[PDB]
C-alpha cells in the first residue's frame, strides 16, 4: 500500500521536570496515533493530523525526531540522567529502568542537547508496515508506538548540593504521518485531552477482585469523564459492575501512591488505563476500573488484585468513542 498522502508536523510538548526521588520517574508518555495527539497551544500543527486520521483507515510514520533542549547548564545542576525510549505497543511495563535499556533509547546528561532519531523500520506496523486508525479495533493493530521519557538520579544544585526544582529540558517532536484507505466512517472525532493539575486519588481492591481508582466527584477529571463517557456499557466478571465502553489513558507525573498488591509497579510506572464504573455514586467519589493495557480495557479484563490495600497531577486522554 503506497500512501495517499503524507503530512509533516512539528510541536512543542512541554518540559522534563527535575528528579527528587533518586529513583526512576516518568516525565512524559507521548501517543503517536493520529487521532490521539492533542491540538493545543504549542501543537497546532497536529490539527491536520487528527483530521486525516479521522478520514483514512491506515497510518504509518515516515520518521520521528525527538529533540531535547537543555533548559539549565551543567555548571548549575548535577546528578540526573534522562532517557528517551520507544514503547512499541504503548503498553505499560513493570521493568523500570533496566527494561527501558532494552528498548531503542537515548540517554542525555543534564545540561546537554540531543536529538533522538528513529528510522521507519523502527516504527512499522503489522499490516505490511501500517497501523489501523480506528481506536475501537483490536489494540495490537491500532495504537502503535509511544515515546516515553524517564529520569534517573536526584537533581542537585551544583553549588549548594541542595534539591533543585525546575525544568531540565524542553521537548520538541517532529514527524510525518502517512495515510491510506478510506475511513468507513470518518467520525470527525474530537477526543478529549486534558490535565487535572491536582487531585486526590485512592485505590481499593481485595484478593481476586478488580483494582479500583477513586477520584473526587467534582474534580475536572471526574467531571470530564462523566460528560464524555459513552452511555453504552459492559459487565465484567460476575455480579459485577457495569463500566463505560469509553477508555481513558491516565499519566501521573506528581512524584507516592500505594495500591493493593501486586500493582505497586503500575502506579509507580506512572500510567495506566481506566473505565468509569456505573454508580450512584457515592460513597463519596467517582470510581474507575484500572486496566493493564488498552486491549485489556477494550475486552473488559481489569487488573485483579492479590490482596487488600496495605497528591497527583493527572494528564488524561480519551482513547475512545464508541460507536465504531
Residue numbers in the entry: 77 to 331, 335 to 389, 399 to 412
What do the authors of the reporting publication say about this deposited model?
HAstV is a nonenveloped virus with a T=3 capsid and a positive-sense RNA genome. The capsid protein (CP) of HAstV is synthesized as a 90-kDa precursor (VP90) that can be divided into three linear domains: a conserved N-terminal domain, a hypervariable domain, and an acidic C-terminal domain. Maturation of HAstV requires proteolytic processing of the astrovirus CP both inside and outside the host cell, resulting in the removal of the C-terminal domain and the breakdown of the rest of the CP into three predominant protein species with molecular masses of ∼34, 27/29, and 25/26 kDa, respectively. VP34 is derived from the conserved N-terminal domain (VP901–415), which comprises the capsid shell (i.e., the continuous, spherical capsid), whereas both VP27/29 and VP25/26 are from the hypervariable region with a different N terminus, which forms the capsid surface spike.
To further enhance our understanding of astrovirus assembly and maturation, here we report the crystal structure of VP9071–415 from HAstV-8 at a 2.15-Å resolution. VP9071–415, which covers the conserved N-terminal region of VP70 except for the putative RNA coordination motif (i.e., aa 1 to 70), was crystallized as monomers with 1 molecule per crystallographic asymmetric unit (CAU). The structure of VP9071–415 is organized into two domains called the S domain (residues 71 to 256) and the P1 domain (residues 257 to 415). The S domain has the typical jelly-roll β-barrel fold with eight antiparallel β-strands that is broadly conserved among many viral capsid proteins. The P1 domain has an antiparallel β-barrel structure composed of seven β-strands (i.e., β9 to β15) and three α-helices (i.e., α3 to α5). The P1 domain is connected to the S domain through an asparagine-rich linker loop (i.e., residues 257 to 267). A substantial amount of surface area (∼2,400 Å2) is buried between the S and P1 domains. An intramolecular disulfide bond is formed between C82 and C254. Additional disordered regions include residues 71 to 76, 332 to 334, 390 to 398, and 413 to 415. A Dali search indicated that VP9071–415 is a close structural homolog of the HEV CP in spite of the lack of any detectable sequence similarity.
